[PDB]
Scaffold this active site. Structure first.
Site, PDB file in Angstrom:
ATOM      1  N   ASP A   1      -2.463   4.844   5.291  1.00 53.37           N
ATOM      2  CA  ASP A   1      -3.121   6.128   5.126  1.00 53.37           C
ATOM      3  C   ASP A   1      -4.195   6.043   4.051  1.00 53.37           C
ATOM      4  O   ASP A   1      -5.271   6.627   4.187  1.00 53.37           O
ATOM      5  CB  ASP A   1      -2.099   7.220   4.780  1.00 53.37           C
ATOM      6  CG  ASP A   1      -1.112   7.479   5.912  1.00 53.37           C
ATOM      7  OD1 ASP A   1      -1.552   7.646   7.073  1.00 53.37           O
ATOM      8  OD2 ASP A   1       0.106   7.525   5.636  1.00 53.37           O
TER       9      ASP A   1
ATOM     10  N   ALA B   1      -0.001   2.659   2.298  1.00 57.54           N
ATOM     11  CA  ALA B   1      -1.127   1.732   2.413  1.00 57.54           C
ATOM     12  C   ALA B   1      -2.088   2.077   3.552  1.00 57.54           C
ATOM     13  O   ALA B   1      -3.284   2.263   3.332  1.00 57.54           O
ATOM     14  CB  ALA B   1      -0.609   0.321   2.586  1.00 57.54           C
TER      15      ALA B   1
ATOM     16  N   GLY C   1       3.534  12.917   4.358  1.00 57.96           N
ATOM     17  CA  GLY C   1       2.779  13.212   5.562  1.00 57.96           C
ATOM     18  C   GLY C   1       1.552  12.336   5.650  1.00 57.96           C
ATOM     19  O   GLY C   1       0.800  12.222   4.688  1.00 57.96           O
TER      20      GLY C   1
ATOM     21  N   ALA D   1       1.209  -0.037  -6.870  1.00 56.19           N
ATOM     22  CA  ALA D   1       2.000   1.033  -7.475  1.00 56.19           C
ATOM     23  C   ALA D   1       3.193   1.328  -6.577  1.00 56.19           C
ATOM     24  O   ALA D   1       3.491   0.564  -5.659  1.00 56.19           O
ATOM     25  CB  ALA D   1       1.149   2.300  -7.639  1.00 56.19           C
TER      26      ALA D   1
ATOM     27  N   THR E   1       4.115   1.104   0.982  1.00 53.75           N
ATOM     28  CA  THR E   1       4.099   2.478   1.490  1.00 53.75           C
ATOM     29  C   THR E   1       2.749   3.214   1.315  1.00 53.75           C
ATOM     30  O   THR E   1       2.071   3.017   0.308  1.00 53.75           O
ATOM     31  CB  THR E   1       5.210   3.277   0.794  1.00 53.75           C
ATOM     32  OG1 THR E   1       6.421   2.508   0.815  1.00 53.75           O
ATOM     33  CG2 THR E   1       5.443   4.599   1.489  1.00 53.75           C
TER      34      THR E   1
ATOM     35  N   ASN F   1      -0.861   5.831  14.670  1.00 52.92           N
ATOM     36  CA  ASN F   1       0.120   5.613  13.624  1.00 52.92           C
ATOM     37  C   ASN F   1       1.466   5.755  14.302  1.00 52.92           C
ATOM     38  O   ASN F   1       2.194   6.718  14.057  1.00 52.92           O
ATOM     39  CB  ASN F   1      -0.041   6.674  12.544  1.00 52.92           C
ATOM     40  CG  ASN F   1       0.572   6.256  11.236  1.00 52.92           C
ATOM     41  OD1 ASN F   1       1.539   5.489  11.203  1.00 52.92           O
ATOM     42  ND2 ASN F   1       0.022   6.761  10.142  1.00 52.92           N
TER      43      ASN F   1
ATOM     44  N   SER G   1      -6.044  -3.237  10.996  1.00 55.54           N
ATOM     45  CA  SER G   1      -5.538  -3.557   9.674  1.00 55.54           C
ATOM     46  C   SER G   1      -4.619  -4.777   9.821  1.00 55.54           C
ATOM     47  O   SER G   1      -3.784  -4.842  10.733  1.00 55.54           O
ATOM     48  CB  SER G   1      -4.804  -2.351   9.062  1.00 55.54           C
ATOM     49  OG  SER G   1      -3.602  -2.034   9.735  1.00 55.54           O
TER      50      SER G   1
END
Ligand SMILES: Nc1ncnc2c1ncn2[C@@H]1O[C@H](COP(=O)(O)OP(=O)(O)CP(=O)(O)O)[C@@H](O)[C@H]1O
Ligand SMILES: Nc1ncnc2c1ncn2[C@@H]1O[C@H](COP(=O)(O)OP(=O)(O)CP(=O)(O)O)[C@@H](O)[C@H]1O
Ligand SMILES: Nc1cncn1[C@@H]1O[C@H](CO)[C@@H](O)[C@H]1O
Ligand SMILES: [K+]
Ligand SMILES: [K+]
Ligand SMILES: [K+]
Ligand SMILES: [K+]
Ligand SMILES: [Mg+2]
Ligand SMILES: [Mg+2]
Lengths: 297, 297
Positions: free
Chosen positions: A240, A238, A27, A278, A236, A148, A208
């Site tokens: 947020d 990133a 989420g 990561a 992934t 988003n 961004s």
């Protein structure tokens, strides 16, 4: 100052064995919230979830991470979102979509309110968001709108432009990705749309730019903020993570000025990165210690 | 004689650790079908699934287990039912199994057996598949075994339940019901006060399953009781379905049924009911012939 995050929280199911699934916290609003908290900031999650096994799991993650769940109403006539990843949506009326204006807490001056277009997808959550932002403004609070975009999730994509615009009006700061500027504007080159929202009413835009960092668009001009160079391992979460860092810094003072804003974007990029070297989304978010070890290299 | 099973096939998600889900083939019709097949009987599954992951996966399980899937169609537009056991969180709103229709029904032969639960009567299309299915099998000289497998929650307005149960029991050659469902069905604190509920609805043969007790047979010749083996509960999920599978496997070994065969069927039904409760998952401990005997003794 407290940072309110309103929106989606769901459970992603990822393969483990030929007969099992690992339940990951997911989420956009959830990650941002865990981010701010996992950085020692005061963050409250405003939302809705099912009293099912999933919603309870999620609520626990918020607590393990220091996210105030006082306004995370867990209902039983609702179903928490569960996704099968390969990616897949099993629950559709979605419980995080039932969060409503009466699910909102009282706001205090200098507090920050966050929301993405994701919470603007389905009607109930739509009012929570728009009324939420209106109330925080009225209380001398700040609103950070992160477009988003996830068209796919939108029934009538004709609503998108309208909501985004009505959102830029209420927002203090708008965060958008280069790709999104092209989707919304239609231009092929994002820099051809760097004033899309500014015209829609937002005097401060943060764009961004992936590995190229960020671009701040304010009334006086635009300032580029490159990002740390790293070994891309998975992008992934990133975005947020980027917003979480931004919100953590901005909440460190009643008014945000030149220096604070420039500092926030720096922090935003730092988080954005670690959230890329990561794997995973919530499990890439750093802790104040990791951020420095990474920062100073 | 072939045993036709029509209904739901789903993925049951069984909580392992406080961070994982065990993935197991699920669905009441599915379990019963895999049960009869494992015992060596000829069983065909009549149903609907999505050309999705749970769908292809599930189809594969039926094949690994010897269940004829010639009348199981996978529709891309549909979504295969996924759920979480606790007691049941129904992730997928309608759910593919809901789309079976009379056209999907296969030509029936004399002495075959047709199976279905109230679960397949919950939604509009499937409802016709079941009721017309049972009517056609009777017209063909075959038998119908109706298992009222009540799941009130999954319904629209529970006012339809009493009516459908009655129409089903009318079509049934044999009705299987649990002590618990009887009450819920016909207001009552104790089942005995209502063990003739279906019998008064048109079913002259009733098998009432009694948890770890076994079951009670009810034919005009009188009432009889069968004791369930002494076994250690790990997961009850599936007991009832394993019970009916065993029953159908035995009844299908002959063209006609009566106390000898019927009394043997219930014995076999209890054996299966016992074994299945010794493992996580609805069809995990469904026995093979060899195994059924080492356990019988
Ligand atoms: N290759 C890279 N090297 C260093 N940092 C990176 C990076 N890629 C992304 N980042 C960091 O992550 C931030 C946000 O990611 P990005 O710019 O790709 O937007 P996004 O697409 O993830 C958000 P959205 O999901 O809303 O479209 C970048 O501004 C930067 O701070
Ligand atoms: N605790 C236990 N120990 C041994 N056997 C058991 C058992 N519980 C159930 N069984 C076996 O399984 C059979 C059916 O159990 P039960 O009636 O509880 O299933 P159920 O209530 O799920 C039927 P339905 O699917 O209609 O709701 C029992 O009659 C017995 O044969
Ligand atoms: N399909 C379904 C809907 N609600 C519960 N079920 C199924 O009931 C079976 C046990 O009888 C479980 O396998 C579960 O999938
Ligand atoms: K504005
Ligand atoms: K990542
Ligand atoms: K009958
Ligand atoms: K079981
Ligand atoms: Mg992106
Ligand atoms: Mg039951």
């Amino acid at each position: 100052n407290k940072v309110w995050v309103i929106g989606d929280a769901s459970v992603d199911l990822v393969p483990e064995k030929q007969n099992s699934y690992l339940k990951c916290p997911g989420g956009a609003s959830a990650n941002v919230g865990v981010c701010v908290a996992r950085l020692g900031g005061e963050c409250g999650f405003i939302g809705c979830l099912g009293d099912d096994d999933a919603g309870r799991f999620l609520r626990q993650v918020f607590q393990d991470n220091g996210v105030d769940v006082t306004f995370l109403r867990l209902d039983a006539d609702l179903t928490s979102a569960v996704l099968i990843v390969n990616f897949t949506y099993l629950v559709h009326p979605g419980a995080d979509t039932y969060v409503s204006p009466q699910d909102l807490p009282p706001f205090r001056q200098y507090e920050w309110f966050y929301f993405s277009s994701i919470g603007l997808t389905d009607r109930p959550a739509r009012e929570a968001c728009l009324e939420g932002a209106r109330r925080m403004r009225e209380a001398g609070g700040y609103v950070l709108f992160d477009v988003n975009l996830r068209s796919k999730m939108w029934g009538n994509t004709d609503e998108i432009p309208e909501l985004i615009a009505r959102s830029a009006a209420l927002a203090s700061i708008c965060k958008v990705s280069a790709d999104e500027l092209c989707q919304l504007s239609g231009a092929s080159h994002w820099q051809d749309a760097r004033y899309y929202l500014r015209d829609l009413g937002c005097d401060t835009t943060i764009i961004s730019l992936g590995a190229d960092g960020a671009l701040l668009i304010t009334a006086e001009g635009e300032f580029h903020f490159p990002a740390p160079r790293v070994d891309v391992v998975d992008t992934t979460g990133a975005g947020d993570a980027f917003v979480g860092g931004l919100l953590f810094t901005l909440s460190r003072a009643n008014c945000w000025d030149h220096a604070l804003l420039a500092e926030a974007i720096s922090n935003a990029n730092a988080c954005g990165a670690m959230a890329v070297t990561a794997k995973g989304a919530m499990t890439a978010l750093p802790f104040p210690d990791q951020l420095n070890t990474f920062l100073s290299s």
